[PDB]
């Protein structure tokens, strides 16, 4: 349990009728944006979505990404959520219209249920039956058990160095085997052998457990393009033979859709459409808002929550047009735009109290007003970053709770950006030996 910048966000805090209530689940105020994000969460769960775009306006300091983490904890662990910033789309190995499709294919989720039948235990004998099939007795501390092996899983046992009485761990379903060690009954056969002597497991020999587990479609794309991990031994050279990201063509994705729809029609897997949260979308340039306008029109595309804080700025990559939000109006008509208004002075105090009781820093009511004064007069990100140093100035001076004096000391030890700009301009007047170098 360590505090982040969004630890106190638990959920959107809605009613049963989809109406936001003030000071609920960590948020303070911000009604209409939480109502709209609740509608977005219901749209994601409704499974009637093949590409929808949601833009979040509002300047810096307001709660844009807090809404996104509220959505991410409102969906749960089940439905996948991929947060990427705009600046991650640039690479030096692939084009930047292919990393977008890699994020779209990381967004869609594919849930498979398995019943793994694991076999822990000491090998009793290695008897080749036919001349082929090789029986193995797996002795536990509860009883041994015979086991008939396929002639291909035995060539995976045999590659491992399993001889007489090594404890092993056979997966029955997936056919995965690991040699855990040599059993301690055969420990002191010789006296300085070099193995890992482990005791016989004091449980069952046949443990049957079931596991629900997810796979993203991008992992299917990578596992079908290039051999990965298992038998890819020439990758230890590194220079040309490493697993470099390659240009996954449209034909490969068009076939993987066929195969996944085949395994959904058999009732094996389940499909769950995810969320792609692209943050600070002004860093996306015009060679990607062209490609999003195509890639959202697929019948498989996930919902895209874009976040952008800028005003009428210059679209990157094409310097001769200005547009709102850094988003071209060719693309801006698709988006559902949600506003994010600033904070009143009576709605900053509650954020101070919630952020204080998240970090455990308790403080008197004469200091909450001072932190709210710095929140009104300077910024919201700065006033919340004085609750943690002042507690360090509290338990050192023989106190437990934070008073006005510790914050009056921390405002001098920890200057903000505005007073540093004033010192940088006015106090740092002459550019000489002991001056700043503009």
């Amino acid at each position: 349990h360590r505090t982040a910048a969004h630890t106190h966000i638990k959920g959107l805090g809605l009613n049963s009728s989809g109406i936001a209530e003030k000071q609920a689940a960590g948020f303070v105020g911000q009604c209409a944006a939480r109502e709209a994000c609740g509608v977005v969460v219901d749209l994601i769960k409704a499974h009637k979505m093949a590409g929808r775009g949601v833009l979040l306006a509002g300047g810096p300091g307001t709660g844009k990404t807090a809404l996104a983490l509220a959505i991410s904890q409102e969906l749960g662990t089940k439905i996948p959520f991929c947060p990427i910033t705009g600046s991650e789309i640039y690479s030096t190995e692939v084009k930047k219209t292919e990393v977008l499709m890699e994020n779209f294919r990381r967004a869609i989720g594919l849930r498979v249920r398995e019943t793994k039948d694991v076999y822990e235990g000491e090998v009793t004998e290695m008897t080749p039956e036919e001349a082929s099939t090789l029986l193995i007795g797996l002795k536990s501390a509860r009883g041994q058990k015979k086991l008939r092996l396929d002639p291909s899983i035995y060539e995976a046992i045999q590659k491992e160095r399993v001889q007489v009485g090594d404890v092993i761990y056979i997966e029955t379903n997936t056919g995965a085997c690991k040699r855990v060690g040599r059993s301690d009954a055969y420990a002191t056969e010789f006296d300085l052998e070099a193995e890992e002597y482990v005791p016989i497991p004091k449980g069952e020999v046949h443990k049957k457990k079931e596991i629900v587990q997810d796979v993203t479609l991008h992992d299917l794309d990578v596992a079908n393009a290039r051999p990965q991990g298992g038998q890819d031994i020439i990758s230890m050279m590194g220079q040309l033979m490493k697993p470099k990201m390659t240009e996954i063509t449209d034909k490969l994705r068009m076939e993987i859709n066929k195969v996944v729809q085949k395994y959904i029609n058999q009732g094996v897997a389940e499909l769950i459409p995810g969320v792609l949260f692209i943050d600070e979308a002004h860093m996306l340039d015009i060679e990607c808002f062209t490609y999003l306008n195509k890639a959202l029109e697929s019948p498989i595309a996930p919902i895209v929550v874009l976040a952008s804080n800028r005003g009428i700025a210059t679209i990157r990559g094409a310097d001769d047009l200005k547009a709102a939000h850094g988003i071209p109006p060719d693309f801006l008509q698709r988006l559902l735009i949600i506003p994010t208004h600033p904070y009143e002075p009576d709605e900053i105090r509650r954020i101070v109290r919630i952020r204080a009781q998240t970090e455990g820093v308790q403080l008197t009511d004469a200091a909450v007003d001072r932190v709210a004064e710095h929140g009104v007069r300077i910024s919201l990100r700065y006033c919340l970053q004085l609750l943690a140093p002042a507690s360090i100035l509290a338990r050192v001076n023989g106190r437990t709770q934070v008073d006005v004096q510790d914050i009056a000391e921390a405002e001098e030890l920890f200057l903000d950006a505005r007073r540093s700009a004033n010192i940088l301009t006015s106090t740092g007047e002459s550019g000489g030996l002991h001056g700043f170098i503009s």
Partner: protein, 647 residues
Amino acid sequence: RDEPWKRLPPPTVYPVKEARFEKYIPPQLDGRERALAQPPGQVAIVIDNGSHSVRAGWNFEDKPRLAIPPIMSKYRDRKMGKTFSFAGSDCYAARSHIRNAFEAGTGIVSNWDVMEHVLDYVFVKLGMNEDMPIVMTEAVANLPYSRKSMSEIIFECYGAPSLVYGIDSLFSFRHNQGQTGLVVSSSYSATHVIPVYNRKALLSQAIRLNWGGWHMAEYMLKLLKLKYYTGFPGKLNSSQTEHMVRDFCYVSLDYDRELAGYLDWTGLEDRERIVQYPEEELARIAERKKESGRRLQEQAAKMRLERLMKKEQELEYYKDIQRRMQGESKKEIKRLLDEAELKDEAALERVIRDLERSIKRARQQRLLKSNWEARQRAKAEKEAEKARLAEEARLDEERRKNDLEGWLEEKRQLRLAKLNQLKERERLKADLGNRKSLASQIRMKNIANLALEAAIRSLENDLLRYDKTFSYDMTLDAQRDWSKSLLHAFRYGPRPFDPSSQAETHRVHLNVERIRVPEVLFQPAAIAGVDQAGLVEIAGDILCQRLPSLPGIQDAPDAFLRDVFLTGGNTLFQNFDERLRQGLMALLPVGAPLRVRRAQDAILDAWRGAAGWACTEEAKAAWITREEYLEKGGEYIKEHDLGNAFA
């Protein structure tokens, strides 16, 4: 540290239960009067020929009448002029000429002159004044000569209608109402494992382990003889070790974890089991020691003063030579230095400096003035040295009022240096009792070429007072104390040492012997070196490798695992059936209905089974009458399903 034995409770001690006599001589004649009242064919005398305790009685009762050891003893008194010979429990174990009917370590009778008198005592104390059938037990796969000799003693010495031999563990099986199982019976002489299939013993494949309660007693005697190493003032009989094993040993469930953390200090007081065995003159001695001490101090003080005076005289002599050398020619300085046996003026200054440092550290009126001035110089030197030490102490205290860390690092380095010096000395000391050491070779090479504890305590005291990270455990004294060694915990316990008192030296402590001695049944080849297999491994060899490979039986795991029960006398240990159940659970396949239990009256059901068997139709169809002994011979075997194989 006084803590580990300050709040320690007073000990709860158990005395020695030696197998003594008991004040009873009954000539019980009330059994023959009841035996002659029953109809014929249903009266028989049953004798369990046990190696530890021969039992005997009539079949129509539940408890045996006589339960005696095979001990006998014969004497002749010349002060009385009479031959004595009594046997059984009437021997006191004051005289002992004891010889037993059974061979020590094996339940095969080979001491027939004792067995004859034991049977004589049995037939006397039952009441025989004149011819009943005899049902008698023997060992598994008995030797034919022993059966021939026993049958010869039964027919020829006493005169009997019929007798029949059987295996006592199988009688306890038949009394326990089993049909098919795996009888594991740990007796006094050997531990048998016998598979029984539909009330029939499969004696072609029964296996006896060569360990038993007598081996328990003898191995316990050997380990108490080797534990108390320097000589224990007490008679260590075998029988008292047997009674120690009977009430102070239990088979541990998980042995390799219980054993390795057994002799830890925390909680040894509850593991350990302990066994008993049956001012004016001080002021005058203190004054004499004070007076002898005063005289030695006075002599030492005189010698010290004399040495100081001699050094002062020598210093004056060399200073005089130094003064005479001031202003003399280089030739006269060499003559004065040669007269003083000195090589150079530098050697003279070194001798004067050394003598001054040593003194600084340390007619009648003329002599008295010279002695008084010498004492004043010595006192002035001592006072100057004391002043110097006091100043150094003050400066050290003043420095301490300042830095402490750098001070602690210096004290740690000084401690390490002194420890290394102690180790180098210990090494030199150990090497001095040795030769190959290069130390004697370097000495011989040199001859051939020619041909602190107080300081450590002082530093530790300083670290204990000022260093919070330095504990008493890190002191040299702590690294040298009983509470550290395990051998005191192994022989004596967590209490302090024996001060050679009356009721303290005569004590035997038991720690490991509780779980080491009854463990030999499962790991024989390692603890006691008997080159055979464990009980678990024998049971697994029979259940998993021989019985499925034997034709004529239906289910090898589905039938023999229904009832595995434990019979013999060497079985009433705490947690003995559970160990065998966990071993067989580790060996058998998963799902076998294993149910290990034990008999009801483990030391007495071997008699009751032959008591209930004695007067049935199968027993009537398995007797050997007298004319059958006269015709068929001696080694004739009625093949019964409990007795051994016919020959």
